Amino acid sequence: PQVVKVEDIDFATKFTPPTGSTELDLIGYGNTGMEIETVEIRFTAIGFYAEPSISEHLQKWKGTPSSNLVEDDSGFHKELIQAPVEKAVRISIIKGIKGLPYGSALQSSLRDRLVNNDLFEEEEEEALEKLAEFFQPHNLPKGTNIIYHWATPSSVKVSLSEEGKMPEDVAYTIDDAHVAEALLDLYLGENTITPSTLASVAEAIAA
């Protein structure tokens, strides 16, 4: 259709991020989590969008089982992440959170990924501090939208809006290519914080 339910939240099947020139299709969706004293709680609804052509860049995976694709060392993750097409994630907050803890968690997770790949130099460290600082003054209540748009492979346009509206302008830009790739790896990599979104995406490509 034109609208899909992700955790009873409406996600459009097609979407142009703020200030973008290109219509992106909904490839997969899922959720991310949080915990309180080991109890698992649903934190956000996620939708992963990309230029329709991403399907053709990944033709070679057609007809493989989804379970093959998401398995470690399959190679699919990196080819998904590196597909030379525009991509975006739309996040809809399910459990409200202050902006500092969210930005610090993001920083922590992106650092871990960059460190684990020997890519965490002073440039990446500064870019992450400034990303965390962007979020620190905001509150992210239930229903808030966060859009990350990979307009170029080395850049991420970050935009935010209240429930019911998409953002009109870009609020923040990530200018570091390694951070930009780490942010995609956060959602689509072997150690993804959202296995459900990755499983949804792989299904969509394999079929």
Residue numbers in the entry: 3 to 209
Quote what the paper states about this structure:
Rectification of CHS catalysis occurs through direct protein–protein interactions between CHIL and CHS, which alter CHS kinetics and product profiles, favoring naringenin chalcone (NC) production. The protein X-ray crystal structures of PpCHIL-A and VvCHIL reveal CHI-type α/β folds with high structural homology to each other.
PpCHIL-A and MtCHI-I have a high degree of structural similarity and align well to each other (C⍺-based RMS = 1.213 Å). This structural superposition reveals that PpCHIL-A contains a potential ligand-binding pocket that is analogous in some ways to the active site of MtCHI-I and complementary to the shape of naringenin, as it is oriented in the structure of MtCHI-I. Within the putative ligand-binding pocket, the tryptophan (W221 by VvCHIL numbering) is highly conserved across green plants with the notable exceptions of the two CHILs from P. patens, both of which possess a leucine in the same position (L188 by PpCHIL-A numbering). In summary, the structures of VvCHIL and PpCHIL-A suggest that PpCHIL-A may possess a binding pocket that is suitable to accommodate naringenin. This structural hypothesis is consistent with the observation that naringenin binding to PpCHIL-A has a stabilizing effect, which is similar to MsCHI-II. A significant error in the AlphaFold model occurs in the β-hairpin motif abutting the ligand-binding site, which has significance in understanding protein–ligand interactions. The protein X-ray crystal structure of PpCHIL-A reveals a binding pocket that is analogous in some ways to the active site of MtCHI-I, and molecular dynamics simulations have revealed that the active-site architecture of MtCHI-I directs stereoselective ring closure of NC to form 2S-naringenin instead of 2R-naringenin.
